[PDB]
C-alpha cells in the first residue's frame, strides 16, 4: 500500500515509515521563522494519494442539494488568493514526556511535531458563500472535510470545524494550494489541503476531495473517537469519547530548542532559544525562562512581528542570552503566557491522558557548563 | 465579607457564593475604587462622541426605548479574585480577596454595538481602534474611573457587550452602577465601567490609570523597583479558574459520604468542559458533575457550578483540590509561586482545602 509514497528528507526523525510520520530535529526546528517544506513535520495516517492535477475536482455539496465541482484552475482563478502564516501543531506534540510518566498509545513525538509556513489559497468562506451558503445558520452547524487518502475498506480521513469558524473572515481558514511560495508537496496535501489557523493539526485535512455543511460533526473516526482530552484517571476500560469535546483550539505551549539535553556548554555567555505558541489566534505575550529548575525566572526576548489582535496564527521564536559560570549545572525550563493570560502547568502527571495528547507542562533541559 | 469600607469593597461568604446559579443582587460582590455616585435619573445623560465631532446624548428613557433590549447571563470576576493565595507566597499590594470576588447575573440592556452604530460609527475600522469608557465616580483631583476594550469586541454581535440598565430583572443597584454600566462578557471585571458618563472611540487605549498602570500580569521576578506597565498588555480575557466552596478549610466532616462543591469559569466565552477533583492532595482525581445549560459555542459567559459526592472514611485527613479545563483545553497550573506577581492578580493555581473526617 505504501509503494507509491513520496521520497522524504532523511534528517527528519522518523517514528513511523508506513504510514510516514516524521519530525525535524530540534537543532533545525527553530532556525528559521518559516519551516522549510522539506523539514516541516509530517503526519500521515494512510498511504499518500498520487493525484493528477488536471483531472482533480473538489466537490462542495451545495445548500439545496446542488453540487459545485471545482478544478484546481477555478479554485485559483475564481477566488482571490489569500496568504496566511500559520503554525500547525499536532495534538501529540511532546507526547514522549507524557509517556515517561506512564505509557500511552500514540506516535512517540518529541518537541518537533510543530512547523510554520506561509500558506496561500482560496478562503473557505469565499468558497462556501459562492456555493450558496449564508453567513450564519440557526444553531450549531459544522463544515466537514474528507481526504482522498483512505483505509482498507475505503473510509477516508476526515474532520470538521464549526460553521462559524468556516464563515468568519478573521479566522482565515484556507483551501490551500501553496506552501512557502511553491505548490503543496505530496506529503503536505498536494494539490489542495484545508489549513485551519489556531487549531489542532488533525482538522487541516490534506488531499481534500470534499466539503459539506452538516448539522452534526464529521462522523469520521478521527473526529468522533480520537483527538480528545480526558481526566488522568481514565484508562482504556473506562474511556468514553462521548464525554469530551473534539480538540479544536489548542492550549499555550513552549519548548527549548537550544541547548540540547546533555550539552556541556562553554563558559561566558549562553543563548537559550526556543519556540512558543498558543491556539485560537492568541498571541504569546511573555516567555519566562529559568536556569535553576523553575525556582527563579528571567524574561526572554520575543522575536518576530506582531500580528493583528486575535489573529496570532504563527509561533513566537524566543531567545535569552545569559552569562554562565564554569563548572555550573543548569536546568533550563520555559513557560509561555498568552493574550488571555493562560499559562502552562508545572507538571505532567495531572495532565496525563491515555493517548498522550495535550502535553504542555513546562519543558525542562539539563546541561552543564564546561570547567 | 468587607475588606475595605471607604471606598467600599466586599465578597459573599463562601457558604453562600455558589448556592444559586444567579447571584442575588444583595450578594453580588462589590468593587469600588472611588465614592459611589448618587445619580439623579431624570437629568442623567450618556454622552457618546460620534465619528465626526458630534455628540449623541442619551437619556435613560431613550437608552431603553430606542434600542431593543438584550439579555445576557454573565459572570464578573475581579482580577484580584483569590489574591489571598498570592499573599501567602510573598506580600503583594491589593485588596485581600478570598475566593468570592466573582458573581453571576442576568444583565439587561442595550447592545454597545447598536449604540455605536446609531451614533454613526462603522462596523469595522482598519488598524487597532478602541472604545473608551468613563464613570461618574471621581478621585480628589477629579479624574474619573475609566477603561477601554478593543473596537472589534465592542462591535461584534457575538461578543454580547452591553450598556446594562437591569441586573437580575431589577434596575441596577447603586453599588452596581445605577443607572447604567458596561458589561463586557468573558472579560475581567475592571473593564465593566459602572455609572457610565461617556463612551468614546479612540485610536489608542483609555489613558486611565487603571487601563495603563494597573491590571496587568508580570513575570514572578518583577518587583516594585523594576515593574514597567509598558511591558505587558492590559488584562482583557481571563484564564480558566476554579474553587471549592464546600466544605470549608479546617472542617471536620462526618464519615460515609461527602459532597464537594464549587465553581469553574473561563474567559473569552470558553466553556468549562471538565472539573477534576482530588481528595489526596492531587495524586488521584475524579470527575465532577457540571451543573449548567450549555451556551452557544464561544458564548459561555457564565460560570459552571459543580459537585462531586464521594465516600470518606472515618478518622482520615483529606486535601481537596479542584482544577478545571476549558473548551480550548487550557488548564490550571499546579502551584502559585511560578505565577506570582507583585499585585497578586491572576491567581488561578489549584485551590486546596484541608478537612478531617470524624470518627
Ligand atoms: N487527509 C489527511 N489529512 C490529514 C492527516 C491525515 O492523515 N490525512 N493527518 C492530520 C494530522 S493528525 C496532522 S497533525 C496534520 C499534519 O499535517 P502535516 O503533515 O502537513 O504536517 O495533518 C492532518 N491532515
Ligand atoms: N466606574 C467604575 N466602574 C468600575 C469600578 C470602579 O471602581 N468604578 N471597578 C471595577 C472593577 S475592578 C471591578 S472587579 C468591577 C466590579 O463590579 P461589581 O462591583 O458590580 O461587582 O467593576 C469595575 N467597574
Ligand atoms: Mo495530529
Ligand atoms: Mo477588579
UniProtKB/Swiss-Prot annotation, chain B:
Gene that this polypeptide is encoded by? SUOX
UniProt function note: Catalyzes the oxidation of sulfite to sulfate, the terminal reaction in the oxidative degradation of sulfur-containing amino acids.
Question: Which metal ions or organic cofactors does this protein require, according to UniProt?
Answer: heme b; Mo-molybdopterin
Predominantly, its location class is mitochondrion
Quote the protein name from its UniProt record: Sulfite oxidase
- GO BP term (any one): sulfur compound metabolic process
Signal peptide range equals: none
Transmembrane stretches in the record are none
The enzyme's E.C. designation: 1.8.3.1
Q: Where is this region: Homodimerization?
A: 217-352
Q: What's the domain of life for this entry?
A: Eukaryota
**Species assigned in the record:** Gallus gallus (Chicken)
The cofactor binding remark recorded in the entry reads: Binds 1 heme b (iron(II)-protoporphyrin IX) group non-covalently per subunit. Binds 1 Mo-molybdopterin (Mo-MPT) cofactor per subunit.
Location of the region described as Moco domain in the Swiss-Prot/TrEMBL record: 1-216
Q: Keywords on this record?
A: Heme, Iron, Metal-binding, Mitochondrion, Molybdenum, Oxidoreductase
Q: Tell me a GO cellular component.
A: mitochondrial intermembrane space
Q: Where found in the cell?
A: Mitochondrion intermembrane space
The record's subunit annotation is: Homodimer.
Per the record, the pathway is: Energy metabolism; sulfur metabolism
Q: Which reaction does it catalyse?
A: sulfite + O2 + H2O = sulfate + H2O2
Annotated GO molecular function terms are: heme binding; molybdenum ion binding; molybdopterin cofactor binding; sulfite oxidase activity
Q: Which positions does UniProt annotate for Mo-molybdopterin binding?
A: 29-33, 78, 137, 176, 181, 192-194
Has UniProt tagged this entry with the keyword Mitochondrion?
yes
Amino acid at each position: 500500500p505504501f509503494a507509491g509514497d513520496p521520497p522524504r528528507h532523511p534528517g527528519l526523525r522518523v517514528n513511523s515509515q508506513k504510514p510516514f510520520n516524521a519530525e525535524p530535529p530540534a537543532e533545525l526546528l527553530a532556525e528559521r521563522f518559516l519551516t522549510p517544506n522539506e523539514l516541516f513535520f509530517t503526519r500521515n495516517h494512510l498511504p499518500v494519494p498520487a493525484v493528477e492535477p488536471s483531472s482533480y475536482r473538489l466537490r462542495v455539496d451545495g445548500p439545496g442539494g446542488g453540487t459545485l465541482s471545482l478544478s484546481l484552475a477555478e479554485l485559483r482563478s475564481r477566488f482571490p488568493k489569500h496568504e496566511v502564516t500559520a503554525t500547525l501543531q499536532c495534538a501529540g506534540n511532546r507526547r514522549s514526556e507524557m509517556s515517561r510518566v506512564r505509557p500511552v498509545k500514540g506516535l512517540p513525538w518529541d518537541i518537533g511535531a510543530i512547523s510554520t509556513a506561509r500558506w496561500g489559497g482560496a478562503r473557505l468562506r469565499d468558497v462556501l458563500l459562492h456555493a450558496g451558503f449564508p453567513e450564519e445558520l440557526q444553531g450549531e452547524w459544522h463544515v466537514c472535510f474528507e481526504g482522498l487518502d483512505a483505509d482498507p475498506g475505503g473510509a477516508p480521513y476526515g474532520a470538521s470545524i464549526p460553521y462559524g469558524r468556516a464563515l468568519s473572515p478573521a479566522a482565515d481558514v484556507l483551501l490551500a494550494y501553496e506552501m512557502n511560495g511553491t505548490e503543496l508537496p505530496r506529503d503536505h496535501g498536494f494539490p489542495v489541503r484545508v489549513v485551519v489557523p489556531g487549531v489542532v493539526g488533525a482538522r487541516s485535512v490534506k488531499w481534500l476531495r470534499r466539503v459539506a455543511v452538516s448539522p452534526d460533526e464529521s462522523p469520521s473516526h478521527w473526529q468522533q473517537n480520537d483527538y480528545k482530552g480526558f481526566s488522568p484517571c481514565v484508562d482504556w476500560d473506562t474511556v468514553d469519547y462521548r464525554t469530551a469535546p473534539a480538540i479544536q483550539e489548542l492550549p499555550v505551549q513552549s519548548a527549548v530548542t537550544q541547548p540540547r539535553p546533555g550539552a556541556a556548554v562553554p563558559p561566558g555567555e549562553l543563548t537559550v532559544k526556543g519556540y512558543a505558541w498558543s491556539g485560537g489566534g492568541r498571541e504569546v505575550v511573555r516567555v519566562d525562562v529559568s536556569l535553576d529548575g523553575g525556582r527563579t525566572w528571567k524574561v526572554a526576548r520575543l522575536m518576530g512581528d506582531k500580528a493583528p489582535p486575535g489573529r496570532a496564527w504563527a509561533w513566537a521564536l524566543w531567545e535569552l542570552t545569559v552569562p554562565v559560570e564554569a563548572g555550573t549545572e543548569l536546568e533550563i525550563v520555559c513557560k509561555a503566557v498568552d493574550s488571555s493570560y493562560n499559562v502552562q502547568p508545572d507538571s505532567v502527571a495531572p495532565i496525563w491522558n491515555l493517548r498522550g495528547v495535550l502535553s504542555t507542562a513546562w519543558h525542562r533541559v539539563r546541561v552543564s557548563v564546561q570547567d
